[PDB]
C-alpha cells in the first residue's frame, strides 16, 4: 500500500496547531486586555470562541457517531479486523 | 468605557471558525481518503488531531482554573459584582 501519498489535506496539522497557540494566546491576552475596554467585547469574544468550540465539537461528535455506525456496518460486512 | 476598541487579537474568530470548517473538512475527507493509502497516515492524522485537540483543551483548562482562582481572589479583593 501507499505509505506516503499525496496528502494535500494534511494542512490540518498546521491549521490546528497554529490555531491552538494563536487562539489560546488570543483568549489569554483578550481576557487580560478586557480590563481596558467594555465587557461586551469579552462577551462577544467568549461567545464566538465558545460558539465555534461547541460547533467543531458537535460536528465531529455527529460525524463520529455516524462513522461509528457506518464503519461498524461496513466493517462487519467486509471483515472486521484488528 | 470603550465599547469599540482597536482589538487586533480579534482575528481569533477568523482563525477558529475557518479551522472549524477546514480541519473538520480535512478530518472527514481524510477518514474518507484513508482507504486509498496505508492506515499509518490515518494514525498520524488522528494522532496529530487528537494531540492538538487535547493540547488546546488542556491549555485552556489550565488557564481557566488559574483564571478561576486568580479572578476569584481579585474580584473578592476589588469588589465582586454581577
Amino acid at each position: 500500500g501507499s505509505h506516503m501519498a499525496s496528502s494535500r489535506q494534511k494542512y490540518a496539522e498546521e491549521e490546528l496547531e497554529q490555531v491552538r497557540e494563536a487562539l489560546r494566546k488570543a483568549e489569554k491576552e483578550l481576557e487580560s486586555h478586557s480590563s481596558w475596554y467594555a465587557p461586551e467585547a469579552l462577551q462577544k469574544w467568549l461567545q464566538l470562541t465558545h460558539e465555534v468550540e461547541v460547533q467543531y465539537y458537535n460536528i465531529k461528535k455527529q460525524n463520529a457517531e455516524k462513522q461509528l455506525l457506518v464503519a461498524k456496518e461496513g466493517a462487519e460486512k467486509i471483515k472486521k479486523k484488528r | 468605557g470603550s465599547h469599540m476598541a482597536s482589538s487586533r487579537q480579534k482575528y481569533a474568530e477568523e482563525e477558529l471558525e475557518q479551522v472549524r470548517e477546514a480541519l473538520r473538512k480535512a478530518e472527514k475527507e481524510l477518514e474518507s481518503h484513508s482507504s486509498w493509502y496505508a492506515p499509518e497516515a490515518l494514525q498520524k492524522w488522528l494522532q496529530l488531531t487528537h494531540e492538538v485537540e487535547v493540547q488546546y483543551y488542556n491549555i485552556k483548562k489550565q488557564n481557566a482554573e488559574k483564571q478561576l482562582l486568580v479572578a476569584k481572589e481579585g474580584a473578592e479583593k476589588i469588589k465582586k459584582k454581577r
Partner: peptide
C-alpha cells in the same frame, strides 16, 4: 478518557476497520 478521547479512539478504530486502506 474524555468524550473526545474515547470517541477519537473508537471512531478512528472503526473508520480504519472499514477504510484502513492498506488493510
Amino acid at each position: 478518557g474524555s468524550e473526545l478521547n474515547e470517541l477519537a479512539e473508537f471512531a478512528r478504530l472503526q473508520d480504519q476497520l472499514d477504510h484502513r486502506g492498506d488493510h
